[PDB]
Amino acid sequence: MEVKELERDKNRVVLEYVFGAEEIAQAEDKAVRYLNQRVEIPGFRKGRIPKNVLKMKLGEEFQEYTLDFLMDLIPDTLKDRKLILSPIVTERELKDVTARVVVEVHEEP
């Protein structure tokens, strides 16, 4: 969880929080949990739905939840700062794992 200051308009700042991997795990987990006590899935016991299920039967919604939990860590960061109004959240996004590789090919003619 490393934050980086973008712009500063006198007393109006705009910080950028970027969360680690493990951090997303826990956040994910808080989600998985938070949901189990709120939704029901045809084929599973109450509060027993696996993450693979939710993650696939929730679509980008589960992704939002995971982010929500990641937000909580924020408050506990501005403790030393003397604030006026509660910090707003301009934007946010969760980028899933991804791999890339380019290759060079030669054809006939």
C-alpha positions as a LaTeX table, in Angstrom:
\begin{tabular}{lrrr}
\hline
Residue & $x$ (\AA) & $y$ (\AA) & $z$ (\AA) \\
\hline
Met1 & 0.00 & 0.00 & 0.00 \\
Glu2 & 2.17 & 2.87 & $-1.34$ \\
Val3 & 0.60 & 6.27 & $-1.85$ \\
Lys4 & 1.93 & 8.93 & $-4.23$ \\
Glu5 & 0.85 & 12.62 & $-4.27$ \\
Leu6 & $-0.27$ & 13.83 & $-7.71$ \\
Glu7 & $-1.29$ & 17.47 & $-7.55$ \\
Arg8 & $-1.53$ & 20.13 & $-4.86$ \\
Asp9 & $-3.91$ & 23.09 & $-5.13$ \\
Lys10 & $-2.95$ & 24.99 & $-1.96$ \\
Asn11 & $-4.82$ & 23.00 & 0.68 \\
Arg12 & $-6.58$ & 20.63 & $-1.75$ \\
Val13 & $-4.37$ & 17.63 & $-2.51$ \\
Val14 & $-5.03$ & 14.59 & $-4.68$ \\
Leu15 & $-3.29$ & 11.39 & $-3.48$ \\
Glu16 & $-2.98$ & 8.12 & $-5.33$ \\
Tyr17 & $-3.19$ & 4.91 & $-3.35$ \\
Val18 & $-1.85$ & 1.77 & $-5.02$ \\
Phe19 & $-2.33$ & $-1.55$ & $-3.28$ \\
Gly20 & 0.00 & $-4.50$ & $-3.07$ \\
Ala21 & $-0.86$ & $-8.08$ & $-3.93$ \\
Glu22 & $-1.35$ & $-9.67$ & $-0.53$ \\
Glu23 & $-3.36$ & $-6.59$ & 0.30 \\
Ile24 & $-5.72$ & $-7.42$ & $-2.51$ \\
Ala25 & $-5.97$ & $-10.99$ & $-1.22$ \\
Gln26 & $-7.20$ & $-9.94$ & 2.19 \\
Ala27 & $-9.45$ & $-7.35$ & 0.55 \\
Glu28 & $-10.75$ & $-10.06$ & $-1.73$ \\
Asp29 & $-11.24$ & $-12.32$ & 1.26 \\
Lys30 & $-13.12$ & $-9.68$ & 3.25 \\
Ala31 & $-15.38$ & $-9.59$ & 0.18 \\
Val32 & $-15.86$ & $-13.32$ & $-0.19$ \\
Arg33 & $-16.76$ & $-13.34$ & 3.49 \\
Tyr34 & $-18.96$ & $-10.23$ & 3.48 \\
Leu35 & $-20.93$ & $-11.79$ & 0.66 \\
Asn36 & $-21.37$ & $-15.31$ & 2.07 \\
Gln37 & $-23.51$ & $-13.85$ & 4.81 \\
Arg38 & $-25.61$ & $-11.94$ & 2.27 \\
Val39 & $-26.18$ & $-14.06$ & $-0.86$ \\
Glu40 & $-27.35$ & $-17.55$ & $-1.72$ \\
Ile41 & $-26.03$ & $-19.78$ & $-4.50$ \\
Pro42 & $-27.98$ & $-22.77$ & $-5.92$ \\
Gly43 & $-25.76$ & $-25.67$ & $-4.87$ \\
Phe44 & $-24.04$ & $-24.33$ & $-1.76$ \\
Arg45 & $-24.81$ & $-23.97$ & 1.97 \\
Lys46 & $-25.60$ & $-20.58$ & 3.46 \\
Gly47 & $-22.33$ & $-18.67$ & 3.92 \\
Arg48 & $-20.31$ & $-21.31$ & 2.09 \\
Ile49 & $-20.02$ & $-20.02$ & $-1.49$ \\
Pro50 & $-16.43$ & $-20.44$ & $-2.79$ \\
Lys51 & $-14.51$ & $-17.49$ & $-4.24$ \\
Asn52 & $-14.29$ & $-19.17$ & $-7.65$ \\
Val53 & $-18.06$ & $-19.21$ & $-7.65$ \\
Leu54 & $-18.56$ & $-15.58$ & $-6.70$ \\
Lys55 & $-15.68$ & $-14.32$ & $-8.89$ \\
Met56 & $-17.41$ & $-16.02$ & $-11.83$ \\
Lys57 & $-21.01$ & $-15.62$ & $-10.75$ \\
Leu58 & $-20.63$ & $-12.01$ & $-9.73$ \\
Gly59 & $-18.77$ & $-10.56$ & $-12.67$ \\
Glu60 & $-17.16$ & $-7.16$ & $-12.24$ \\
Glu61 & $-19.38$ & $-6.62$ & $-9.20$ \\
Phe62 & $-17.15$ & $-8.76$ & $-7.01$ \\
Gln63 & $-14.31$ & $-6.65$ & $-8.33$ \\
Glu64 & $-15.97$ & $-3.54$ & $-6.99$ \\
Tyr65 & $-16.40$ & $-5.10$ & $-3.54$ \\
Thr66 & $-12.76$ & $-6.14$ & $-3.35$ \\
Leu67 & $-11.97$ & $-2.47$ & $-4.03$ \\
Asp68 & $-14.33$ & $-1.27$ & $-1.31$ \\
Phe69 & $-12.47$ & $-3.15$ & 1.30 \\
Leu70 & $-9.20$ & $-1.79$ & $-0.07$ \\
Met71 & $-10.60$ & 1.67 & 0.66 \\
Asp72 & $-10.84$ & 1.04 & 4.38 \\
Leu73 & $-7.11$ & 1.04 & 4.61 \\
Ile74 & $-7.21$ & 4.62 & 3.46 \\
Pro75 & $-8.77$ & 6.36 & 6.53 \\
Asp76 & $-6.14$ & 4.93 & 8.80 \\
Thr77 & $-3.59$ & 6.74 & 6.67 \\
Leu78 & $-4.73$ & 10.29 & 6.96 \\
Lys79 & $-4.71$ & 10.13 & 10.76 \\
Asp80 & $-1.64$ & 12.38 & 11.05 \\
Arg81 & $-3.10$ & 14.79 & 8.48 \\
Lys82 & $-5.35$ & 17.61 & 9.69 \\
Leu83 & $-8.36$ & 17.40 & 7.39 \\
Ile84 & $-11.40$ & 19.56 & 6.72 \\
Leu85 & $-13.75$ & 17.40 & 4.71 \\
Ser86 & $-13.76$ & 13.63 & 4.22 \\
Pro87 & $-11.44$ & 12.57 & 1.33 \\
Ile88 & $-13.30$ & 11.96 & $-1.93$ \\
Val89 & $-12.42$ & 9.13 & $-4.33$ \\
Thr90 & $-11.91$ & 10.52 & $-7.82$ \\
Glu91 & $-11.47$ & 7.12 & $-9.49$ \\
Arg92 & $-10.39$ & 3.53 & $-8.84$ \\
Glu93 & $-9.86$ & 0.27 & $-10.69$ \\
Leu94 & $-8.78$ & $-3.31$ & $-10.20$ \\
Lys95 & $-6.58$ & $-4.72$ & $-12.95$ \\
Asp96 & $-6.74$ & $-8.50$ & $-13.10$ \\
Val97 & $-3.65$ & $-10.61$ & $-13.68$ \\
Thr98 & $-2.41$ & $-10.47$ & $-17.21$ \\
Ala99 & 0.42 & $-11.74$ & $-19.38$ \\
Arg100 & 1.86 & $-10.49$ & $-22.68$ \\
Val101 & 4.42 & $-11.74$ & $-25.20$ \\
Val102 & 5.16 & $-10.62$ & $-28.74$ \\
Val103 & 6.69 & $-12.88$ & $-31.35$ \\
Glu104 & 8.39 & $-12.39$ & $-34.70$ \\
Val105 & 7.37 & $-14.65$ & $-37.59$ \\
His106 & 8.65 & $-15.03$ & $-41.17$ \\
Glu107 & 6.33 & $-16.30$ & $-43.88$ \\
Glu108 & 6.85 & $-17.70$ & $-47.39$ \\
Pro109 & 6.09 & $-15.26$ & $-50.21$ \\
\hline
\end{tabular}
